[PDB]
Amino acid sequence: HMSLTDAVAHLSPERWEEANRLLVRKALAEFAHERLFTPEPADGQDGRYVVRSDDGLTSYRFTAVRRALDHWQVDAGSITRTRDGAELPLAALDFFIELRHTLGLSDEILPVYLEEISSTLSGTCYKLTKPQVTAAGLLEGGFQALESGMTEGHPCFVANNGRLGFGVDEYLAYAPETAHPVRLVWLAAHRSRAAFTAGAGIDYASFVRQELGEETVERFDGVLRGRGLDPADYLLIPVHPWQWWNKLSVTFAAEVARQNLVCLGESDDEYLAQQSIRTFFNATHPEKHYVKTALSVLNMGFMRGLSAAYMEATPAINDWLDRLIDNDPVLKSTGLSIIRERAAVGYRHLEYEAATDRYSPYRKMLAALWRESPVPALRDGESLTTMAALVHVDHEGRSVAGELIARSGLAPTAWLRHYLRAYYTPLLHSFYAYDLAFMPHGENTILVLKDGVVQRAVYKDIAEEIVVMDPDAVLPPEVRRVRAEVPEDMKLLSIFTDVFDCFFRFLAAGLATEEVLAEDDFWRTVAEVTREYQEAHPELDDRFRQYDLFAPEFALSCLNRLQLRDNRQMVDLADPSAALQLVGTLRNPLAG
Amino acid sequence: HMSLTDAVAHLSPERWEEANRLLVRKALAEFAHERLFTPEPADGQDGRYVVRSDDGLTSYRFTAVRRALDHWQVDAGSITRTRDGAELPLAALDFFIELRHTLGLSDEILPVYLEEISSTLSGTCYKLTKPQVTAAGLLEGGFQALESGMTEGHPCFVANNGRLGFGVDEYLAYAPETAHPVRLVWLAAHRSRAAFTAGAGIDYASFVRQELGEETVERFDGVLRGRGLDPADYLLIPVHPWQWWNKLSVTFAAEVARQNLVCLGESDDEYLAQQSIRTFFNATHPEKHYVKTALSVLNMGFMRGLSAAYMEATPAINDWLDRLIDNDPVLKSTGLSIIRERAAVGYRHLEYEAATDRYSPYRKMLAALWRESPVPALRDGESLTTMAALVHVDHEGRSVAGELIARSGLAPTAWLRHYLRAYYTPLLHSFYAYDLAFMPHGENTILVLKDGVVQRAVYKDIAEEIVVMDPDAVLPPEVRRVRAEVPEDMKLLSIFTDVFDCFFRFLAAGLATEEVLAEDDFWRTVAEVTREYQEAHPELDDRFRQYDLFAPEFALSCLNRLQLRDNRQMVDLADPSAALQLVGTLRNPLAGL
Numbered sequence A: 001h002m003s004l005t006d007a008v009a010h011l012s013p014e015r016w017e018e019a020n021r022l023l024v025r026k027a028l029a030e031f032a033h034e035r036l037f038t039p040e041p042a043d044g045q046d047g048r049y050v051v052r053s054d055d056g057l058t059s060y061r062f063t064a065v066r067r068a069l070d071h072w073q074v075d076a077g078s079i080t081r082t083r084d085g086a087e088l089p090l091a092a093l094d095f096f097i098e099l100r101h102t103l104g105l106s107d108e109i110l111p112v113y114l115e116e117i118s119s120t121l122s123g124t125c126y127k128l129t130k131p132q133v134t135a136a137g138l139l140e141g142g143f144q145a146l147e148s149g150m151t152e153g154h155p156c157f158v159a160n161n162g163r164l165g166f167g168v169d170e171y172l173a174y175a176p177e178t179a180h181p182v183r184l185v186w187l188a189a190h191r192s193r194a195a196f197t198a199g200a201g202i203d204y205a206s207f208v209r210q211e212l213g214e215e216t217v218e219r220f221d222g223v224l225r226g227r228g229l230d231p232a233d234y235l236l237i238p239v240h241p242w243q244w245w246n247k248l249s250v251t252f253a254a255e256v257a258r259q260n261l262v263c264l265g266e267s268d269d270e271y272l273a274q275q276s277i278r279t280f281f282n283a284t285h286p287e288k289h290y291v292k293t294a295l296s297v298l299n300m301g302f303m304r305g306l307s308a309a310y311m312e313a314t315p316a317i318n319d320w321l322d323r324l325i326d327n328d329p330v331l332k333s334t335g336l337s338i339i340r341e342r343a344a345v346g347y348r349h350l351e352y353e354a355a356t357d358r359y360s361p362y363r364k365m366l367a368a369l370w371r372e373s374p375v376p377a378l379r380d381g382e383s384l385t386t387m388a389a390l391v392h393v394d395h396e397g398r399s400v401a402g403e404l405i406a407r408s409g410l411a412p413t414a415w416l417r418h419y420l421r422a423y424y425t426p427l428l429h430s431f432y433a434y435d436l437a438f439m440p441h442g443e444n445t446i447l448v449l450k451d452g453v454v455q456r457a458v459y460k461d462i463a464e465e466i467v468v469m470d471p472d473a474v475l476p477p478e479v480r481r482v483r484a485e486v487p488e489d490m491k492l493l494s495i496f497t498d499v500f501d502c503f504f505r506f507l508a509a510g511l512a513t514e515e516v517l518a519e520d521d522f523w524r525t526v527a528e529v530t531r532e533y534q535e536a537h538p539e540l541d542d543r544f545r546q547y548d549l550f551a552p553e554f555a556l557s558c559l560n561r562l563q564l565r566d567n568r569q570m571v572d573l574a575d576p577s578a579a580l581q582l583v584g585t586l587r588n589p590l591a592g
Numbered sequence B: 001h002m003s004l005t006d007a008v009a010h011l012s013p014e015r016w017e018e019a020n021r022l023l024v025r026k027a028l029a030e031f032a033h034e035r036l037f038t039p040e041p042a043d044g045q046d047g048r049y050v051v052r053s054d055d056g057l058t059s060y061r062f063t064a065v066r067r068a069l070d071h072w073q074v075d076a077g078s079i080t081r082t083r084d085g086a087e088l089p090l091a092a093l094d095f096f097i098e099l100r101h102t103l104g105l106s107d108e109i110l111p112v113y114l115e116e117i118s119s120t121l122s123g124t125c126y127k128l129t130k131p132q133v134t135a136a137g138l139l140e141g142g143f144q145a146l147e148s149g150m151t152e153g154h155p156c157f158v159a160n161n162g163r164l165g166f167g168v169d170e171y172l173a174y175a176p177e178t179a180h181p182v183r184l185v186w187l188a189a190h191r192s193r194a195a196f197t198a199g200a201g202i203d204y205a206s207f208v209r210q211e212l213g214e215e216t217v218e219r220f221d222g223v224l225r226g227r228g229l230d231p232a233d234y235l236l237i238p239v240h241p242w243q244w245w246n247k248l249s250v251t252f253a254a255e256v257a258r259q260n261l262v263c264l265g266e267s268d269d270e271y272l273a274q275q276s277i278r279t280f281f282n283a284t285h286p287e288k289h290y291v292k293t294a295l296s297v298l299n300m301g302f303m304r305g306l307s308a309a310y311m312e313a314t315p316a317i318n319d320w321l322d323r324l325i326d327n328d329p330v331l332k333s334t335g336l337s338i339i340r341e342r343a344a345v346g347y348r349h350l351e352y353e354a355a356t357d358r359y360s361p362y363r364k365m366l367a368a369l370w371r372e373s374p375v376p377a378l379r380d381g382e383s384l385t386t387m388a389a390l391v392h393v394d395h396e397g398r399s400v401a402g403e404l405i406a407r408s409g410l411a412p413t414a415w416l417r418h419y420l421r422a423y424y425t426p427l428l429h430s431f432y433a434y435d436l437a438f439m440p441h442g443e444n445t446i447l448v449l450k451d452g453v454v455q456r457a458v459y460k461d462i463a464e465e466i467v468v469m470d471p472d473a474v475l476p477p478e479v480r481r482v483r484a485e486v487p488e489d490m491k492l493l494s495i496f497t498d499v500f501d502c503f504f505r506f507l508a509a510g511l512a513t514e515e516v517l518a519e520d521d522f523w524r525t526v527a528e529v530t531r532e533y534q535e536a537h538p539e540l541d542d543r544f545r546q547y548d549l550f551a552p553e554f555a556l557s558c559l560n561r562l563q564l565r566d567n568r569q570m571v572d573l574a575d576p577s578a579a580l581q582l583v584g585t586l587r588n589p590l591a592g593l
Ligand SMILES: Nc1ncnc2c1ncn2[C@@H]1O[C@H](COP(=O)(O)OP(=O)(O)OP(=O)(O)O)[C@@H](O)[C@H]1O
Pocket: A152, A153, A154, A155, A160, A161, A275, A276, A277, A278, A279, A292, A299, A300, A304, A388, A441, A442, A443, A444, A460, A461, A464
């Protein structure tokens, strides 16, 4: 009963009530932003709104402050729910069922979507169990206290933390917000099925020696020899323990039995799950590589396995981009860097390949890559934070961005100006000069701080995410795969959607509500940095006109709509712009 | 490394080779029986045949003895696989991929089906790790040594032991063939959502006191009071641990958090999973009830959850059948009994009900029932065995049926006659006198043995399985749902398929290959017992002519074809006859005899 009751102790009536209030608040706000419903001003009161269930008989009433880019800052405490003239408790599950038709939830998707909602609420309950920490307290804790202290997740997606596949015990062991140390499972994979791809400067033997140590390498060698096997025929693959215990040991039982796969045991180092869940920071040795693992759990619109076939191209692309950054003085002056995916390993399951198509999750169950740590490059007085921290608000209403602005002693617009030159200017130059787009959200960006000021930004998650939006661009063989055909009037969405509407809308609204920086000042600083860039590069004036960042309007691209339409595979990934749902337009805050 | 490497130690190259040979043997045999392919005689040798892949380029060659009911006794040692003029190793996964179109495996189902094959093979490797035990050794061990010592599973279905949802550690903890003790998880379920239904003579308070004991009852009471709750508002529901840790604490987290469900902790008694996986025998107190739990894993064509809505009528239906058995002298003279489903509890998840349709697995995640133990009724010198043991063959080639025949000192036909009067005669009478059909396979039947002789049969798995094949039958209200509309020329399949073609085919073939009893003698004995029943009841002659058990032929109803067509829900269950795949006819072994 003790471990049994402890595992569910975070699930209490009061925490569940709070979690539901918060999640329904987010659902009202973001589903309004995407025009799934239009909140109508309420019968008495001004600034109070009502949204009704599908059949009209249930009313959700609330107050909200409206801000730029159609942002609805819904007040959590103001939300009421009424049916038949009686107040009802707030329950996100009932919410989605009552609105199943308005929100476009098919009968096939709704039950699974409700599981993701339930897990997101359970995660909020666990996070409410943790010690309260201020923004300053997080900064004092450091890089991983910030990483595991984030509570919101992706700011747009309501059903963003499902992690479907975790039992509650596995949730407690593996969720990044629990910050429990994890030991990776190491497998020996026969070279008839497994391939190791080394980035520029990497050598397999020395790479493995540096990552594991001579003693552990010798122990693994001895396991293989104890089985009568030649270690030279095998490669090392680290795996998430969930994947081993629940998928590889069962789904790949034939590979284990025939000794195509050999379980070597656990790593000596202790690892911490990052916000992506499936990527691990090495806590014992922060200078060692991240390990990104295949995890066949559902989270935020995709199964989180990792494609064995694509590992073959991954290090080279990083090398290519790394050279591009290094040879461009505009990018060099911004201090931009990437933490490269340096090495990758993939296992090709021949029978499942014969049994499936190219995009199956069965081809994504066993692969791993290693990513450079950002810690070694730190200079004196510098510290690291995930960019998501900028829009994390603590129990007192203080955000990390606000705490940093205060601690720095600079004017808010000046602090913002440094942040924008580190993070946003490189995106402008990549787009205009190279047709290059990232996916630069809060989880894919790390900020280097000194004296409370953003010194420079580090990008990650590269080979899977970058796009060169020119099908006929001249590119080296191993990089030519990132080219894509994106319609002309959608290319600048890489800035409009991914930067403005999916991150800056939240940061500007937060800093305004926090009474640190007014909306007009935020967006004026953004416009100033944009023109500061463009006026410095008249050789691109034509492209500046072709892709006008100062147009009066741009398309509203809805993110939740993607997940509500297809829970398991939000976008094709072979044609990712085909699933986008642009619903009208937003007024560009840069129009002035 | 220690627990990691131990958990997969049963997965070795030699055990995997043996498992793949055995499973491909079964696939050739049963897919031939169901006419998915027709083995072509290989020129030159009398009993050698060849089966080819979809593209014709891979050949599986084997010897087989052909037996009644189109039974193919494929010899495991003879199987070879050749492609492009080269011999290849035997691999069940490759077999199904090579034959995906011949077998009707869609692109959606094939990968999941391969997972079921892989887990079946892994279970065989584990079973190969266990101490070798003879048929006599199993009989010496007793009821649960036999229950967990069964190795085949269902004799028709090739992908019969998937248990999809178990990780390898959960396999080791929960699979019936590992026989590791299990402690059930007890939940308190609020009476606004959970309902307890008792059979006649059952009382909730005394029922729980007898099953748990006053100490545990009060401990659970104190858990509820410690949270400020009134125990009178709650009911107890036992749950499979896998179900709690993987489904109820996550999928029903809203119910746990709001205290509609309260985790009370583990039971004191230790339980053993039975062949059905989700039903548990109480090892600490064998006289106490079985607990059948909801288990949302896929096995042999169905998710194994338990419907909350059906619980309310389950005890009453059992009571009804019990009285029927009790008032009929023909059934009484056979010694037939059922172990009743005596109590049941169901949890109605209102949000998931609103979000799904009546067939959803989401409505089958939280329910339980309690089934009488057969141990108390045992008399002096009597022992118990699953009927599945009769077709279990040990490492020396002796079946448990052969061991019992030898130990009894009876001639094989005389032994068989006692077994048939206990097991088969009640099925004849249920059909002809009541339009009643069971699902009487090896796992749903327990045999009572004395002096190596079958004294009587115990039927289980009742309310969800019985069918009254008469839509206008006069029945008490709470029982009327067991009525069904079955096409006329399919009603007698309840004997032809479920008894003859799905169990006696294997028993007869096995006792013949074992050189205990010739096929003709087996089937002649079955014919004799059939006439022994029918001649004793001339008032039913019309029905005997209407449903002729001596007809020259009857339909071949294919079992694997169902699972190959629909991995997750082999049959509708609102209309179970519509999914059946009849492919030609079989020669009735009783036609001559
Ligand atoms: N604030 C955040 N913004 C964006 N994604 C987030 C955030 N917090 C958590 N995530 C998680 O990160 C994942 C999506 O990000 P993405 O595809 O970029 O990561 P990945 O490829 O899985 O991992 P990595 O970034 O280590 O390569 C989802 O699992 C999502 O829920």
